[PDB]
Amino acid sequence: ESQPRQNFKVETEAGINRQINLELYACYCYQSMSFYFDRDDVALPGFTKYFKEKSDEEREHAEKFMKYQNKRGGRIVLQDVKKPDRDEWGTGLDAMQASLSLEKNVNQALLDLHTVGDKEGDKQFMDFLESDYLEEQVEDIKKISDHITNLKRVGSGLGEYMFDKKSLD
Amino acid sequence: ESQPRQNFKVETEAGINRQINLELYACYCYQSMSFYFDRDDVALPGFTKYFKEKSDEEREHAEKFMKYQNKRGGRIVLQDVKKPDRDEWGTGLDAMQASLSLEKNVNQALLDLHTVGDKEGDKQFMDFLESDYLEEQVEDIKKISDHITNLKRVGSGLGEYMFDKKSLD
Amino acid sequence: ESQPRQNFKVETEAGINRQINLELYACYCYQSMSFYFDRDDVALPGFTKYFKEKSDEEREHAEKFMKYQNKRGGRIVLQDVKKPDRDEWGTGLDAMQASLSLEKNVNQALLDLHTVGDKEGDKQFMDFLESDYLEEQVEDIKKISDHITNLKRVGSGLGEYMFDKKSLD
Amino acid sequence: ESQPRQNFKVETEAGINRQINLELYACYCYQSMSFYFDRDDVALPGFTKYFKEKSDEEREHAEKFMKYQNKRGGRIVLQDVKKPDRDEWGTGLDAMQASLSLEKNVNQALLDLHTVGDKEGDKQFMDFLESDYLEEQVEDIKKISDHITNLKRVGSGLGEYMFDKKSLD
Ligand SMILES: [Fe+3]
Numbered sequence: 306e307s308q309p310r311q312n313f314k315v316e317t318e319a320g321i322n323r324q325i326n327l328e329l330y331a332c333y334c335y336q337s338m339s340f341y342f343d344r345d346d347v348a349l350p351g352f353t354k355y356f357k358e359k360s361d362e363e364r365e366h367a368e369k370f371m372k373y374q375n376k377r378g379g380r381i382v383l384q385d386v387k388k389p390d391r392d393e394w395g396t397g398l399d400a401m402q403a404s405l406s407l408e409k410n411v412n413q414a415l416l417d418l419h420t421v422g423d424k425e426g427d428k429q430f431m432d433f434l435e436s437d438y439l440e441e442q443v444e445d446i447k448k449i450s451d452h453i454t455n456l457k458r459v460g461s462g463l464g465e466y467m468f469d470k471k472s473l474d
Numbered sequence: 475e476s477q478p479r480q481n482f483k484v485e486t487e488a489g490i491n492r493q494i495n496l497e498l499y500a501c502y503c504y505q506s507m508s509f510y511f512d513r514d515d516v517a518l519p520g521f522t523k524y525f526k527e528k529s530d531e532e533r534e535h536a537e538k539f540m541k542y543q544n545k546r547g548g549r550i551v552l553q554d555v556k557k558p559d560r561d562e563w564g565t566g567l568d569a570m571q572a573s574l575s576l577e578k579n580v581n582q583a584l585l586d587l588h589t590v591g592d593k594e595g596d597k598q599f600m601d602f603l604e605s606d607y608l609e610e611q612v613e614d615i616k617k618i619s620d621h622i623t624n625l626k627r628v629g630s631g632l633g634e635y636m637f638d639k640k641s642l643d
Numbered sequence: 644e645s646q647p648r649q650n651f652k653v654e655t656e657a658g659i660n661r662q663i664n665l666e667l668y669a670c671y672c673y674q675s676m677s678f679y680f681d682r683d684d685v686a687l688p689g690f691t692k693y694f695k696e697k698s699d700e701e702r703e704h705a706e707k708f709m710k711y712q713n714k715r716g717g718r719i720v721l722q723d724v725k726k727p728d729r730d731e732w733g734t735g736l737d738a739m740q741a742s743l744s745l746e747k748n749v750n751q752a753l754l755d756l757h758t759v760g761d762k763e764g765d766k767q768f769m770d771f772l773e774s775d776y777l778e779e780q781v782e783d784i785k786k787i788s789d790h791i792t793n794l795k796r797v798g799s800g801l802g803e804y805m806f807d808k809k810s811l812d
Numbered sequence: 813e814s815q816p817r818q819n820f821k822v823e824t825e826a827g828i829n830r831q832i833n834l835e836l837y838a839c840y841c842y843q844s845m846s847f848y849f850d851r852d853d854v855a856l857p858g859f860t861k862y863f864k865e866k867s868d869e870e871r872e873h874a875e876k877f878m879k880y881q882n883k884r885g886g887r888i889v890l891q892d893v894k895k896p897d898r899d900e901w902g903t904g905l906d907a908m909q910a911s912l913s914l915e916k917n918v919n920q921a922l923l924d925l926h927t928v929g930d931k932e933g934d935k936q937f938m939d940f941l942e943s944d945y946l947e948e949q950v951e952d953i954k955k956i957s958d959h960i961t962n963l964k965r966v967g968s969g970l971g972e973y974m975f976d977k978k979s980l981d
């Protein structure tokens with residue numbers, strides 16, 4: 306038994322390892338999205354930078370979980386990170402809708418991980434999840450939803466071009 | 475009779491109390507408008523901030539009247555502030571037209587309150603109304619009218635999106 | 644179903660709407676208290692400013708709940724905000740005791756809303772309530788209690804006058 | 813007929829001359845009050861400075877009326893300024909009540925002068941009175957009323973001493 310281990314169950318430890326892989330997968334998806342919009346036949350530089358930043362955020366999420374795993378005395382076990390399910394991401398609206406779907410899947414996984422911690426009485430882990438993940442997911446899902454609404458509002462063509470300039474930094 | 479009371483009639487005092495309630499109602503209406511545009515299926519952040527600022531202005535109007543009531547030696551009597559007459563405010567153009575209608579109703583109420591002060595010979599109250607309310611109402615009604623004209627000019631979709639970015643801070 | 648909605652029940656949504664109305668009611672009560680102490684036959688400027696600040700805080704509480712409602716994908720439904728139950732608030736001690744009673748009622752309502760979120764498994768909403776409301780209520784109830792103790796200690800007359808100068812900014 | 817004279821009646825001109833004398837009388841009264849509180853058997857330095865400042869304000873009021881008289885093409889006719897009706901002004905509360913009575917008498921005289929301007933159609937004079945005198949009188953009468961309430965609240969002795977330190981600069 307590792308030196309720090311206290312009130313830390315193997316199921317909670319295994320849940321963190323599977324959440325680490327999912328965060329790395331989201332990181333990979335956003336990285337793919339970012340360079341899709343850097344294609345010369347797509348060429349939307351606001352979308353490129355927006356998804357690059359989200360990719361870096363998801364990598365921070367994964368590493369924070371790795372750090373937490375060590376803090377509690379668990380052991381990181383890494384798996385393959387699967388390639389994203391698409392090579393190309395359509396319009397700015399398509400990519401934003403794919404992004405909402407991804408973020409809601411990540412959120413459900415975090416809520417399920419909270420449920421593991423809850424049944425095992427892992428009081429500190431529950432607060433760590435709420436404070437550093439659940440609140441941010443709620444913020445991001447609201448922001449992406451707003452973006453989707455505005456991408457429908459502006460339409461294709463000049464509208465998409467203007468959204469890229471005005472809504473994304 | 476209160477210590478400051480001089481040239482201050484009960485009808486004027488009662489008129490101020492009813493104007494206080496109307497200003498609080500306008501405050502509530504703009505607050506509702508503001509958070510309607512913060513909905514994820516509306517998502518117009520310029521409209522949100524614009525109506526939040528107007529809501530704060532109407533609250534200042536109400537409190538200035540409460541302060542004046544005390545200055546003259548009257549007594550504030552508060553009533554329920556009714557919920558706004560709509561839950562949802564349509565397009566940016568619809569909300570701007572509802573706002574013009576509200577501001578003109580407030581202006582007519584102020585003009586009617588000026589008429590009470592005039593017939594009672596309340597010289598100071600008349601100047602207080604003209605200097606701190608009537609002039610501002612004329613400015614606001616002109617600004618909202620301009621906004622309505624431009625919201626018709628730009629049309630729906632990208633036009634509404636652009637107006638949100640360019641005409642509202 | 645709105646775009647952001649995830650793990651967000653209609654009972655929780657309805658509880659937030661009723662809490663919004665209660666926060667606006669507390670805002671209205673403190674606004675009434677503030678201008679009661681600005682009366683020329685009361686004339687306690689520390690009390691006036693103290694209750695004005697608390698009124699602004701309660702308005703922030705209401706708007707934060709409106710913002711949260713939108714974040715989760717709920718819909719704000721506003722109701723009449725009832726006028727406060729008193730027109731006049733007695734001595735500084737009476738107003739402070741009315742204020743403690745109000746704050747404890749708000750606190751119980753928040754605890755009841757936490758109970759709704761708990762039974763529905765709304766993990767993020769529970770943390771939002773604890774972090775942004777429950778902690779502040781505990782602080783305020785302790786501060787008001789201290790003020791009540793000191794208002795009894797100093798007595799009426801010069802004591803109330805001195806408390807206004809020394810204990811309220 | 814003087815060069816600037818336009819829409820300026822002899823009754824309005826005579827009313828300004830009598831108001832000038834009244835402002836100088838108020839100046840003299842406050843000057844007497846100020847040095848009464850500088851007596852070694854009174855010795856309230858906040859009261860002394862407060863009434864000295866009010867005396868200087870009333871002198872400014874008189875001179876502004878003299879300036880206005882010249883602006884419109886009238887002619888200043890000065891009269892004796894009568895000594896104040898008391899040699900000694902009692903307690904701080906007595907002096908504050910005498911001061912409220914004086915200010916209300918000045919206010920009624922200004923309102924009567926406004927009535928002269930109104931019946932003669934002197935539009936500019938009416939606005940000059942409202943903007944530079946009537947508004948300030950309403951402010952001062954409210955402030956003095958507040959002071960009277962607090963002087964009753966604190967009582968005699970230490971209360972009066974504390975009011976002198978805390979409520980008057
Ligand atoms: Fe993540």
Ligand SMILES: [Fe+3]
Nearest residue numbers: 359362408445
């Ligand atoms: Fe994210």
Ligand SMILES: [Fe+3]
Nearest residue numbers: 497532535580
């Ligand atoms: Fe207003």
Ligand SMILES: [Fe+3]
Nearest residue numbers: 601604939942
């Ligand atoms: Fe005027």
Ligand SMILES: [Fe+3]
Nearest residue numbers: 528531577614
């Ligand atoms: Fe307005």
Ligand SMILES: [Fe+3]
Nearest residue numbers: 666701704749
């Ligand atoms: Fe609150």
Ligand SMILES: [Fe+3]
Nearest residue numbers: 697700746783
């Ligand atoms: Fe509070």
Ligand SMILES: [Fe+3]
Nearest residue numbers: 835870873918
């Ligand atoms: Fe004067």
Ligand SMILES: [Fe+3]
Nearest residue numbers: 866869915952
């Ligand atoms: Fe004065």
